[PDB]
Amino acid sequence: QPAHLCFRSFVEALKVDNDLVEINTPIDPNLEAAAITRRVCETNDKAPLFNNLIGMKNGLFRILGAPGSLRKSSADRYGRLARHLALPPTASMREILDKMLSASDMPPIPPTIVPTGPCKENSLDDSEFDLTELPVPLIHKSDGGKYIQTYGMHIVQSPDGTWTNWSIARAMVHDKNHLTGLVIPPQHIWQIHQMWKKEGRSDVPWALAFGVPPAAIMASSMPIPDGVTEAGYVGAMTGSSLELVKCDTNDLYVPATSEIVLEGTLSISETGPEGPFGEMHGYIFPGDTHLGAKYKVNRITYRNNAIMPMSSCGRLTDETHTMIGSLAAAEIRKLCQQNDLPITDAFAPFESQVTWVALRVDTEKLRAMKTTSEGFRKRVGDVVFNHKAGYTIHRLVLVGDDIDVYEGKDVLWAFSTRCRPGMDETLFEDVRGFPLIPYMGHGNGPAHRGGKVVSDALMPTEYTTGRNWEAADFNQSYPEDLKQKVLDNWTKMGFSHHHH
Amino acid sequence: QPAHLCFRSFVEALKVDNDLVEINTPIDPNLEAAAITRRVCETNDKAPLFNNLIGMKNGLFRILGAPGSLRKSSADRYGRLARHLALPPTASMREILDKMLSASDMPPIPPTIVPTGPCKENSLDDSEFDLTELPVPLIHKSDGGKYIQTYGMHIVQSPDGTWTNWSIARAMVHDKNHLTGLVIPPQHIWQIHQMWKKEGRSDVPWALAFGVPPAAIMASSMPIPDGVTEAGYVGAMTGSSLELVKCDTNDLYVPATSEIVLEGTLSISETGPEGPFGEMHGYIFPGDTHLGAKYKVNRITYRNNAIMPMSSCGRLTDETHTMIGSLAAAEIRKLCQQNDLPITDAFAPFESQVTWVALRVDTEKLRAMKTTSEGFRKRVGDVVFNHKAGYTIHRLVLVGDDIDVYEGKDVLWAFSTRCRPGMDETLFEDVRGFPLIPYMGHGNGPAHRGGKVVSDALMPTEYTTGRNWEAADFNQSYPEDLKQKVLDNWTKMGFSHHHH
Numbered sequence A, B: 001q002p003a004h005l006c007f008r009s010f011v012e013a014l015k016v017d018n019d020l021v022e023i024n025t026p027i028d029p030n031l032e033a034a035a036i037t038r039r040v041c042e043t044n045d046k047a048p049l050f051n052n053l054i055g056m057k058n059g060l061f062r063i064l065g066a067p068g069s070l071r072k073s074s075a076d077r078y079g080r081l082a083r084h085l086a087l088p089p090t091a092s093m094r095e096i097l098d099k100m101l102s103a104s105d106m107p108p109i110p111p112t113i114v115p116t117g118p119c120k121e122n123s124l125d126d127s128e129f130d131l132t133e134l135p136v137p138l139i140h141k142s143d144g145g146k147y148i149q150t151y152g153m154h155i156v157q158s159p160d161g162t163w164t165n166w167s168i169a170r171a172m173v174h175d176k177n178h179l180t181g182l183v184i185p186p187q188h189i190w191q192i193h194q195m196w197k198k199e200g201r202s203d204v205p206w207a208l209a210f211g212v213p214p215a216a217i218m219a220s221s222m223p224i225p226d227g228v229t230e231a232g233y234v235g236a237m238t239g240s241s242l243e244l245v246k247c248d249t250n251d252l253y254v255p256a257t258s259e260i261v262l263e264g265t266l267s268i269s270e271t272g273p274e275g276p277f278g279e280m281h282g283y284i285f286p287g288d289t290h291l292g293a294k295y296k297v298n299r300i301t302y303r304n305n306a307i308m309p310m311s312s313c314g315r316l317t318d319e320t321h322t323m324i325g326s327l328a329a330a331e332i333r334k335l336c337q338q339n340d341l342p343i344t345d346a347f348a349p350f351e352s353q354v355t356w357v358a359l360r361v362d363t364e365k366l367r368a369m370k371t372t373s374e375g376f377r378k379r380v381g382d383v384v385f386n387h388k389a390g391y392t393i394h395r396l397v398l399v400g401d402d403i404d405v406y407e408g409k410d411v412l413w414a415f416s417t418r419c420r421p422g423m424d425e426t427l428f429e430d431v432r433g434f435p436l437i438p439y440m441g442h443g444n445g446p447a448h449r450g451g452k453v454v455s456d457a458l459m460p461t462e463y464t465t466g467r468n469w470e471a472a473d474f475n476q477s478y479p480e481d482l483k484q485k486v487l488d489n490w491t492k493m494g495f496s497h498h499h500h
């Protein structure tokens, strides 16, 4: 099975790529696995595969850390993401995001039901497992639980059957047969949960599949539109119908090659302690436990020699930056274009802890609009910050065509030099805020509202007659023939490779 | 003579350090020298010494580019600055800035007059030179003149004789015997000029010395207080009285080992076209010529085989970042402490194009103040943005004790995650602004006023009971014994030197 369609194949891909380290000696899921993974993520090292995890019994489970993190080289920086999608490992960020958006004006390719698959190789009933006895990781030393769920996909369906959503949301072990986790607005798992709560008749049928097709986990991390079933979007993106098996204890369908599947219910009434967790913005607030959603597990099915993917998230750079930020940016780019805004590109700079998105403007188009910064900033911020795709993003930075938004150095340069603090900015206090950012949930104002800004790093003549500077850099402040002479004589003179 | 006290010795130091490239084949001062230098600065390469400059005649002149720019290695990143000051080449930024501040509560060591020095080895009168016939560089292709003066020191004295100021301000050739240059408030060359203009009797006696003692050019780039004669401050800093010779045509005194000295007058009446120039923030606005100050040159004296230092300034990283930003930050640190503010450290992040300063707060002291963000932000911004040392800086970022302000990644992390846009900020519109920033002089508001902000990246409990998080990083989210085990087994397991 191809790497983008089968997690087990994905693991082999990483091995083939010389992007894997297999650890075959015993590793403790109490902190040690996650510490090694953290170090990998902070240094862009190879992904770790823990084949001998202390507490693994009856095939549950191995761990793969850092599945969507960065490689050291510039040439294949995003190669792990490219391996989620059948792209060359040198694929650019633009190419990855375009692949992720490609299905947005394609017909869905609905999934194909097959009678069995590897995820049915082993099963444990309601008398045979205990989630407290599995080798679930403690990821950060102050976490409020053992976070089994950092890289699987929750599956929930609307009561009417018309929308089946796939998404990542964290969850931790509560007891032998329950998890607790985040289920918060405006996320689709929350929107669906609310539908079941209003109906009031039953708990939500649920499955949580770990080690799913890599293309599927990418869509699970992207804010594709309300009502859109991720399976059919992934089908369209990959050009193939995904093969799904029915759960044993409910009528939901899981990828046939899922490594581990939990089947059960998401309560419409009960809650339990959840968190704290070392989160995407780089912090944990010890003791900050709050009531979260409560999941009951009725059955576990799994592959022989099952592998659990794990994100050891926190400070730069991990899946919460490479996937949450970039995939929200991609959706925001499309949203802006669908609102007739002249945006060519969007990216969430890593430097911003993925809290900013830089929007590259087609300034030819802007000029034809015959508008001003105040008006344009307002328009852009109303589109983005009133939409779910803008939820996680607190600062938008508008830049002109000379800036490569995928290069954080250049975004920081433009922001710092072209946007006058205050005057060139519009604050948005009456929009949904992202409480996980420390300055929101642990800050001086309302955790859930405001704290957003559009920062205009367009210069005045970019609205009127055209750019009126040249950069004071080697590229722009010297003629072509001179630059090439300099480069051709560089090592001759005594000064100092792309792949590396 | 020691490297910090003699430019010629400094050049040898760089050679000894394996930090110099000597180019002995003909190099054109029309763009080529500056293009090579620009490339050096954008790649942290070795400093170029152009020994065969097309147009050099009778010993005027060789060029040294990138005298205060960065080295590639992390261990000796700031080694060129350390060589200005007799510091080890591995000296940290903190150590360099502390050296630059050390003289601020020392008695001055006034200069020593000596009857001659190398700067008198050759001379040209008022019938023997023509500044249009020297190999003055064209530094950027759209510059409005040939900028002879990018790394020399202007010398001007108050009419009463009590203050002799040394400072860098740019200047370009106007004609055979005049320059034009920037002389703008609140700079000391402007303050002194204004004193002479109010007296109204004569033009200002002036000298411009190139290739001065490196310790002297560092102080020339620092906003030490009004009325303080830089020579005596450098004397105190270095523990030695600087040796100065009298000019031939006026009564000012220049360093005995200056490479090149121009003697003349700074007009109190005349102006001439100046600029545009590829400036520190990374831009040139072609055609943006304005009237600047006008200098008359009456005499040139110079060393045999004179060397002219040159800054090919613009995008990161050159002297306008390493020296302007850092030295303003140092002064701001002291200013804050002298105002009873609990600041331990200050630095202008390169990422900000040196337009921000990050201020590290002793939060134990802050807590004892029993204050709030609004009040504290106001206090800090009133101290800094009403003072000359704050002139160039448009954003101050307050951070707690866990942040190393000399590490721009960490400043960006803290800013992005701990300062709520709007609410956690105070805007300052009625302070002097820095017009050279594009968003000021070429922006939507007054070029000379406002556009400043204090951004509070202190979290709420840093004012009250203490930090209440731990970072989600390898350092903080794992116990010591585990971290050390991970590190000790890192290469054993299969994962991947300080000097490199």
Ligand SMILES: Cc1cc2c3c(c1C)C(C)(C)C[C@H]1C[C@@H](c4ccccc4)[C@]4(C(=O)NC(=O)N=C4N2C[C@H](O)[C@H](O)[C@H](O)COP(=O)(O)O)N31
Pocket: A149, A150, A151, A165, A166, A167, A168, A169, A170, A171, A182, A183, A184, A186, A187, A188, A189, A220, A221, A222, A223, A224, A279, A280, A311, A313, A319, A320, A323, A324, A392, A436
């Ligand atoms: C890639 C990835 C995404 C995550 C998360 C993680 C990783 C690795 C972990 C490691 C588990 C950390 C936390 C961080 C935490 C978080 C919470 C909200 C927003 C962003 C992050 C959260 C989470 O716990 N809950 C949640 O609601 N959304 C998350 N997303 C974002 C969602 O996958 C993304 O928003 C999708 O678009 C949802 O799908 P939908 O559009 O509703 O169908 N997690």
Ligand SMILES: Cc1cc2c3c(c1C)C(C)(C)C[C@H]1C[C@@H](c4ccccc4)[C@]4(C(=O)NC(=O)N=C4N2C[C@H](O)[C@H](O)[C@H](O)COP(=O)(O)O)N31
Pocket: B149, B150, B151, B165, B166, B167, B168, B169, B170, B171, B182, B183, B184, B186, B187, B188, B189, B220, B221, B222, B223, B224, B279, B280, B311, B313, B319, B320, B323, B324, B392, B436
């Ligand atoms: C290191 C350095 C400093 C510079 C400059 C340069 C370099 C290399 C060049 C390459 C020439 C580029 C321009 C950029 C330009 C600029 C203008 C104003 C402020 C900052 C930069 C300016 C300049 O042209 N004029 C000016 O007024 N001050 C400058 N400084 C700052 C001053 O040396 C610094 O401010 C000192 O504190 C002054 O001394 P004082 O305290 O008055 O005794 N230049």
Ligand SMILES: [K+]
Pocket: A166, A167, A168, A219, A220, A221, A222, A223, A224, A230
């Ligand atoms: K999704």
Ligand SMILES: [K+]
Pocket: A418, A419, A420, A424, A456, A457, A458, A459, A460, B439
């Ligand atoms: K602007």
Ligand SMILES: [K+]
Pocket: B166, B167, B168, B219, B220, B221, B222, B223, B224, B230
């Ligand atoms: K000075």
Ligand SMILES: [K+]
Pocket: A439, B418, B419, B420, B424, B456, B457, B458, B459, B460
């Ligand atoms: K704050």
Ligand SMILES: [Mn+2]
Pocket: A165, A166, A167, A188, A223, A224, A225, A228, A230
């Ligand atoms: Mn969805």
Ligand SMILES: [Mn+2]
Pocket: B165, B166, B167, B188, B223, B224, B225, B228, B230
């Ligand atoms: Mn001064």
